[PDB]
């Protein structure tokens, strides 16, 4: 595979074999008082600063030069220009990849098939702006003349995770917006428990689906419409309570949504890159279109940083390369995302899709199988909660787990004169310091001596109190979690993922790996119906089905 | 360490090295049409059936024999009996480990320091029973005479995750219960956005903390008490609105809680095993004490299954050993938990603590350092959502990821004449079948040719459409997600974790690894007050602190 044959990759591997032992953080920081300045970036966006501190990673200045040489060798910069220029870099599907066009506030032309996409992008944005104004002001009335109080997004995956994570994160900005609800699972619990809390007369349903064929979303949408028409008893009332966010005009009409009620996007918007498009309508409705424009603007700023910054000081490139270093030299399977912010409690789940569906790949551009690791398993929970759930394993288990810690300097809720946020910041700082420094047998012994432990009791406990440390982290600190700054942060990680993919020579923008499960579920669905035993699959699938059939009528 | 020198483990690794490439699920099923019957367990709890189908795993009958022999050689049964009989198996802390006593419906004596703990367990249960009846009936009034409409648990980690996951899982059983809120993060967002939705006259605060010294929880409690007293202006009225769940009567009283309002538990209740104790009061308030008892009864049933069942047919032992196989032979870092149930959306989060804080360890019982892997990283999201987020990587990435798929046969919401649950089940079944059966180049070519792809479109797309499969899963299917069945499922995984700890020779029940972060946060705290630079740490901690100071 390309990466394995790359001479810069082999130098990195070779260096790792010879010098891995020189990578002790305790020693590196002691021998370089300037380490933080040398291994950090400060970004002034004009709407907040972002500090990307990667100095607690197991790198030296030689390692980062070799990693930048790898990005050059693998053609990161030329691949970047192909994306921004509208070339069909999604080569398995023959598509452009232009989530950057969605937030292209400069309106500089971006050509696909020689045609500028920005007129159509801005036509849909204008349509969302006007609709949001009418809904939020109460000028858009329901079928009994009431204003809309609840907006329900029905969609899954790329049509759900982004809008949910952003509306969660920007909750302080939703004064005067309708309540927003997200129904995604086919599990009837999800729609049922939501509809039970709603009035059809004041509820606006948004059917989010790129294809408008996804079984979960269409089934959920048909259930919501049946429920709604149970109350309204008039087909023409659907036009006041159902809109669609899709590329598929034909299926939207067949579902019965008026064409004036369809907000379009395009095939070069990948679902996991789609919150910047019409899929973001639930965001604009909740926090207002002006805050949505700020979100796009912050992404635009990061796009420009990614495009114009030399690789060696380019935030998403450096994050990408650090991950390559941990994935392909150290062998780390996972990457933890640990925001110290309750509003970001859906941020890790969002990049599970964004990262893992993009780079969970094993075939290269040339059709050949990779002979190296690709994308990691992404996981995490907000701090401080994670400290009391799983940091035990991060500190004193047997796995190496690169961790991104994120926090805003300014809280949306400066209660008790800042007391809570002070404690939060201090834990944020303490945990990376603890991961890096650890605690030696000599340091733990001195503590147990001072606690007054008997020699027997002390030798028994001592090895359990030792922290081997040397566990690497990234610390990403930003002024405040505004719409603009959220946009910049999400875009930072989008381009991190793009860079890793180029390095691995995979297609970050397709998802052929979801097809087989879909096919097999279509075959199983009609077999579940009766009480007849199923014997047509492997023995486990049959046995599970037959157990299901048996237990259907247990009371 | 103990494990790597154990004869049965070495036999296990040697077989792996010689026969790894013989393990192909597609061929194992093709050659043994009885594979499901020999590699699954069906449990009748008398309150629902559990099918534990472990046949889509990379195991033969010989591998399962060697694994059970490892369990015997590592002494699982004798360790289990020490736990149930009240011995101090949490050896670093010198404590028993008796979450099983908390749900011991049988009331068979369990001695700790020679004294039966069951009377104290049942005294507290009776007290929660009576408090819940009063609150739920409206007998218990607020400081202005109103009934409690909102209950707010304040607590973190083990004092949060269990009750949150259970009340989320048992939502359908909460009719007539007050609404329940969980406040855990120190991040002031968490208490602030909760308090903004509450009426102090009708809100009941539960301060859940085993130590009653955790900084996050005591600060949140102090903030809620300040907020409450700003409205009531009557300090006697705290006794109507604040209770405590703790082992520390001194700190509870010094905080201002009436002694009558403390619900006790004991040092042998681990935080991440605590939802079965007083820590579960918010569960019993939300769904009723009878449903809480049913939850306890399910766990009790699983405790007896674990205790009385021969190892080769013992559900938590088999799950543990299959994990050992993937962890210590295949080298899998992670274990995914994928419940096909929206009510179980915090189940995986609960076992991140349950599993990872228990067995994320590296020092054995003799004080020696492990030379093998221990606990995995636990992660996951509910199906079907996960299919559209990260299953692309499970199917077509470069990682081997053991997965548990869980689902209830009967849904709490049989809308559309069961159409949604029918689809949910079909996806549950399809995904494990797909992970096991890939799709060959040959099969993918035929589909593309049949679809009508031209030779150039076909050959460009074909390699990307191949699924190598051979990806192992457990399927855990149960009649219905009732309180009883939830209790059984949680206890099953608790005992899974126990068994793995014993085999690894580690302490599943301490958590010394949380102490260095707490120390260092206490030293950084006062340094944030100034506008002065800070120079007292490493450059990075210094540099971050000073950027925080610049950007206030």
Swiss-Prot record, chain A:
Residues the record lists as N6-succinyllysine modifications: 453
Modification Phosphothreonine occurs at: 108, 249
Q: Which residues carry this modification: Phosphoserine?
A: 106, 184, 454
Q: What is its EC number?
A: 5.3.1.9
Which EC class is this protein assigned?
Answer: isomerase
Specify the effect of residue 159 to P. In CNSHA4; uncertain significance
Question: What modifications follow translation?
Answer: Phosphorylation at Ser-184 by CK2 has been shown to decrease enzymatic activity and may contribute to secretion by a non-classical secretory pathway. ISGylated.
Q: What is this protein called?
A: Glucose-6-phosphate isomerase
User: Native species of this protein?
Assistant: Homo sapiens
Which gene name does the record give?
A: GPI
